[PDB]
Amino acid sequence: NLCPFGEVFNATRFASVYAWNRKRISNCVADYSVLYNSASFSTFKCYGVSPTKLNDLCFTNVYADSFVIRGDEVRQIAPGQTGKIADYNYKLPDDFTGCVIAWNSNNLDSKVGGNYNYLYRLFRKSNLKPFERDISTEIYQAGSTPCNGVEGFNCYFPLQSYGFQPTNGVGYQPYRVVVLSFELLHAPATVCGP
Amino acid sequence: DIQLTQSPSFLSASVGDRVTITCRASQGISSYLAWYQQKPGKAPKLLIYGASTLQSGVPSRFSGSGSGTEFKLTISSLQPEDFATYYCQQLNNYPPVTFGQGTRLEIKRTVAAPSVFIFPPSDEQLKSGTASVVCLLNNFYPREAKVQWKVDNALQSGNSQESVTEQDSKDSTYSLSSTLTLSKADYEKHKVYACEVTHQGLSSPVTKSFNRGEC
Amino acid sequence: EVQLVESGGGLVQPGGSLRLSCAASGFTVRSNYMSWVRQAPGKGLEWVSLIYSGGSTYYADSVKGRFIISRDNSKNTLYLQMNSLRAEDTAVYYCARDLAVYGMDVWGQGTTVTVSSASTKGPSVFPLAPSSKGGTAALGCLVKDYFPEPVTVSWNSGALTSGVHTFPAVLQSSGLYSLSSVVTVPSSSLGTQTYICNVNHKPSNTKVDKRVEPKS
Ligand SMILES: *[C@@H]1O[C@H](CO)[C@@H](O)[C@H](O)[C@H]1NC(C)=O
């Protein structure tokens, strides 16, 4: 029983980062080295764990989080980072144990004139807690006067479209991200290497 | 780092004209662009965001276009209050060149050659041990002007400074002063101090000069 | 109602400190992106610093580790603490509410910061005597080696304004300013009309009247 990593990494559409997707990986055998040995990924960074030794490890569960962000935002998907993504969309904890995997998806996620399906949260009063997911669409109140759900001055829609467009520079191009979290608890281990 | 370059740096037009200013990003930035107006001594004012969306309050004679690397700000019919400097800003990115270097919109008029004057250092200054030589270009248009200092017919570089007046409120001309600064000992080592002026209103460069120690 | 007011700029020596304030009204600083933008004399806008609603702060590399952006939520005020100042930090500083993809829509009037090692000094005034050679002569006054800005110049106590060009000051490599004021007059008046430039330099309490004659 192999782990359905193919469902995740080769998924045909991806989620918006504000509504990032999470699949629970459990009760399976995980061959990680098919991912690590691959020349497919421009980012493959692990924390609290060595990427070489992944096939020798068992875990209680593995969570696979996936979404799409800008190229120059991939650096925010790491412990201790700040910015629009890390503060307002997807936050990793300081004691993160797992791997961050990303690759350029310009050929898939950009269209002529702009692909407007992928969204990010632009306005938020406070930072996200780690692994928090905010899918609210309340009009953001930037002043003292209440918005009453109506857009206007000091009353902005909190989500914005990336508008990916294939002539973008690399920092503005879409990248697909998969974040594997590993938790080791005082419970039976459902995910082991081969 | 994505850079914004604005061209031209100076642009002349007259009231009623259709004006178009260009800004380029060194890489594609979709529609993440904003345009600002700034008048001398005043804060920038936001005109367009998202490359093409007009800011609330801005007259409809302003429009922005472009997506990717080339963006254009257009003024359909120039108004007297529109003469200002216009700045380009890339959005959702704060690199060293977040703002473009700016384009100054100026008032067009007929060509006028400069009146050139040269002033030797005063005797009073020389007593202090320094000599400043001043060359004046009066009431010319366009802005474009080259001042070349020559000392005993040797082209002088690295020891002059220029400044230019704002465009005159009546006749729309400019004036320019170039100051060549030398120590007393160096000044007394040469005889012919000359200021050669090149400008569109002159069919050939005009030189004003004096021989040191002669009135 | 919606405005930004700045204060705190002034003269400081290199290595000194300055705290700029930016009092807001019409919006809440705690709920907005806020950035500082500066404009060195005669140059363009340079982005300086930025603070998020959630508290994250960012700085251009030219000020990295020397400036600190902060705010007071009760006073609805934005700050910029400026340490280890250098000459190149000389600029007009603006605060602005940053709406990101909607641009920066609210700007303050700006506060002026000057960083220099120069001693305050009143200018020397030297004549630019009319040439011995349309009947229009040009004469003037060279206002040299003063600090800090500004100097005002008038001619014949205000009675001569037609044809006066007082040029913008230029900063010399010594750190002192210099400017010239010129005027064109009828050549026929060089023998009969007195021409005096009135140079005023208020930071050094200097009022100087220089008379410009045709040279012998
Ligand atoms: C995704 O598909 C490619 C090409 O078909 C394949 O080489 C790769 O192993 C797949 N990835 C996963 C995680 O199954």
Side-chain angles (χ1 to χ4, degrees):
Chain A
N1 188 352
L2 272 294
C3 296
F5 284 147
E7 292 286 83
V8 180
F9 286 83
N10 281 335
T12 63
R13 84 181 81 254
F14 261 61
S16 283
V17 67
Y18 89 95
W20 47 273
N21 193 265
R22 160 163 288 195
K23 170 159 209 50
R24 202 145 171 274
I25 305 293
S26 88
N27 302 118
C28 55
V29 174
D31 175 25
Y32 293 98
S33 295
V34 60
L35 302 165
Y36 193 39
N37 294 353
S38 185
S40 301
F41 307 127
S42 52
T43 288
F44 201 112
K45 298 199 199 215
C46 300
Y47 307 91
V49 61
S50 161
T52 63
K53 292 152 204 153
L54 272 176
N55 280 0
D56 296 311
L57 299 178
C58 292
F59 296 114
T60 300
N61 279 318
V62 179
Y63 297 114
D65 299 336
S66 52
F67 47 81
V68 161
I69 52 174
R70 270 168 57 178
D72 53 28
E73 297 175 336
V74 173
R75 72 181 86 271
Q76 304 187 23
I77 317 294
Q81 298 307 300
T82 65
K84 288 184 186 62
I85 308 308
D87 305 341
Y88 302 153
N89 285 264
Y90 184 88
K91 178 66 175 183
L92 283 188
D94 299 331
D95 60 359
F96 180 55
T97 307
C99 301
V100 176
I101 314 170
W103 60 102
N104 189 289
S105 59
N106 199 45
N107 56 337
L108 300 174
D109 290 328
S110 73
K111 304 288 174 288
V112 287
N115 176 18
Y116 296 100
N117 300 318
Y118 290 107
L119 316 171
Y120 64 94
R121 184 169 305 274
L122 179 60
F123 297 107
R124 207 181 196 264
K125 182 175 173 177
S126 297
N127 291 355
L128 286 180
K129 309 183 199 73
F131 291 129
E132 192 178 12
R133 181 173 174 261
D134 184 7
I135 62 172
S136 172
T137 47
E138 295 308 287
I139 305 285
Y140 182 77
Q141 193 180 120
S144 297
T145 304
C147 293
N148 302 312
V150 176
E151 276 168 42
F153 183 73
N154 287 4
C155 284
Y156 314 106
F157 194 82
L159 309 176
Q160 296 287 328
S161 172
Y162 273 120
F164 294 123
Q165 184 172 1
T167 62
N168 278 0
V170 181
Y172 279 86
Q173 284 176 19
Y175 276 66
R176 291 185 173 190
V177 186
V178 169
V179 174
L180 302 180
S181 295
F182 307 126
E183 54 164 11
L184 180 47
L185 297 184
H186 300 270
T190 77
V191 181
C192 288
Chain B
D1 282 339
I2 286 165
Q3 285 177 216
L4 298 180
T5 55
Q6 277 191 253
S7 55
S9 306
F10 293 90
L11 163 63
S12 276
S14 57
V15 164
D17 287 349
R18 197 164 184 270
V19 166
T20 305
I21 287 151
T22 300
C23 176
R24 294 181 179 89
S26 60
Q27 308 164 31
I29 56 187
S30 278
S31 286
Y32 289 110
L33 194 76
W35 286 99
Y36 298 82
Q37 187 184 236
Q38 188 180 31
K39 301 206 187 91
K42 305 311 186 108
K45 165 187 179 179
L46 175 58
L47 300 174
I48 300 160
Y49 59 83
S52 68
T53 308
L54 193 75
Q55 169 75 6
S56 169
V58 175
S60 47
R61 72 180 168 268
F62 287 96
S63 68
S65 71
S67 198
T69 50
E70 262 185 20
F71 306 88
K72 288 179 190 302
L73 167 61
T74 304
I75 295 158
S76 56
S77 74
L78 214 59
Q79 299 279 87
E81 55 263 52
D82 293 339
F83 292 104
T85 298
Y86 291 82
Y87 284 105
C88 191
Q89 188 213 351
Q90 57 181 295
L91 303 177
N92 272 12
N93 203 47
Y94 298 80
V97 188
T98 294
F99 297 90
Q101 76 260 52
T103 291
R104 186 161 191 171
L105 203 48
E106 302 197 289
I107 301 161
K108 192 155 62 167
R109 62 154 280 174
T110 190
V111 178
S115 309
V116 188
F117 309 82
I118 189 170
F119 299 94
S122 79
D123 284 343
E124 186 191 348
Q125 194 193 8
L126 290 171
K127 289 168 223 300
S128 302
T130 49
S132 302
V133 192
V134 172
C135 187
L136 163 67
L137 308 189
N138 212 48
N139 303 349
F140 60 92
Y141 180 97
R143 176 186 280 282
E144 178 65 27
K146 172 197 166 78
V147 166
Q148 176 73 66
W149 282 104
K150 294 186 188 176
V151 181
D152 283 342
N153 222 39
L155 281 73
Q156 215 61 39
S157 171
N159 51 348
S160 57
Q161 289 182 290
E162 282 182 353
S163 83
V164 184
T165 57
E166 302 283 69
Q167 204 171 9
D168 185 82
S169 58
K170 309 191 290 153
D171 60 37
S172 295
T173 55
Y174 311 83
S175 283
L176 187 146
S177 86
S178 176
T179 298
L180 177 85
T181 308
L182 292 184
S183 73
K184 181 173 179 276
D186 287 337
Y187 175 70
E188 296 169 338
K189 279 170 195 206
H190 313 288
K191 187 193 164 176
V192 182
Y193 289 84
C195 178
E196 185 186 53
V197 179
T198 304
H199 185 272
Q200 188 193 336
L202 298 160
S203 55
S204 67
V206 163
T207 297
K208 302 294 178 202
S209 61
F210 65 87
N211 298 324
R212 176 187 56 85
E214 300 173 13
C215 199
Chain C
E1 169 60 12
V2 174
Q3 55 165 348
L4 282 172
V5 173
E6 300 170 41
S7 69
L11 192 44
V12 70
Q13 294 168 86
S17 284
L18 270 195
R19 178 202 198 209
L20 307 187
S21 305
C22 167
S25 64
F27 57 91
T28 316
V29 299
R30 180 262 180 289
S31 295
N32 274 289
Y33 296 98
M34 305 286 285
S35 50
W36 284 98
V37 181
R38 81 181 166 184
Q39 179 165 38
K43 309 231 171 173
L45 304 176
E46 181 185 9
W47 173 81
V48 181
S49 191
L50 160 74
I51 182 168
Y52 283 34
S53 293
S56 299
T57 59
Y58 300 88
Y59 307 87
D61 297 326
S62 57
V63 305
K64 188 67 181 294
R66 293 186 304 121
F67 291 7
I68 312 286
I69 190 165
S70 70
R71 71 192 177 214
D72 192 298
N73 289 346
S74 64
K75 282 160 177 114
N76 201 36
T77 301
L78 173 77
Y79 300 112
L80 189 70
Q81 179 64 47
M82 282 181 328
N83 297 318
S84 297
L85 283 163
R86 315 156 160 163
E88 57 262 31
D89 298 321
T90 300
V92 170
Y93 284 70
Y94 300 95
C95 62
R97 195 259 313 268
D98 202 326
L99 286 177
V101 301
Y102 306 131
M104 305 177 177
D105 61 323
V106 186
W107 294 64
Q109 90 282 346
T111 192
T112 296
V113 177
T114 310
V115 185
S116 170
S117 314
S119 307
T120 291
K121 176 187 170 301
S124 294
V125 186
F126 302 120
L128 299 163
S131 179
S132 50
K133 300 168 164 300
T136 306
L139 64 91
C141 278
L142 175 60
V143 178
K144 192 150 155 66
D145 289 340
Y146 68 88
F147 183 88
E149 294 270 48
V151 166
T152 76
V153 187
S154 66
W155 284 90
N156 296 342
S157 303
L160 180 64
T161 55
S162 167
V164 168
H165 292 304
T166 300
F167 287 93
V170 183
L171 176 61
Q172 305 158 106
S173 57
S174 68
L176 314 180
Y177 292 97
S178 186
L179 71 81
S180 255
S181 178
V182 297
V183 65
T184 50
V185 304
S187 287
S188 63
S189 76
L190 294 188
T192 179
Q193 176 69 41
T194 301
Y195 292 107
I196 299 161
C197 69
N198 318 108
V199 179
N200 197 2
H201 189 246
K202 64 188 74 61
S204 65
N205 304 293
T206 299
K207 298 179 74 69
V208 165
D209 303 323
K210 172 55 71 155
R211 194 192 147 120
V212 188
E213 314 191 61
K215 191 183 190 223
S216 278

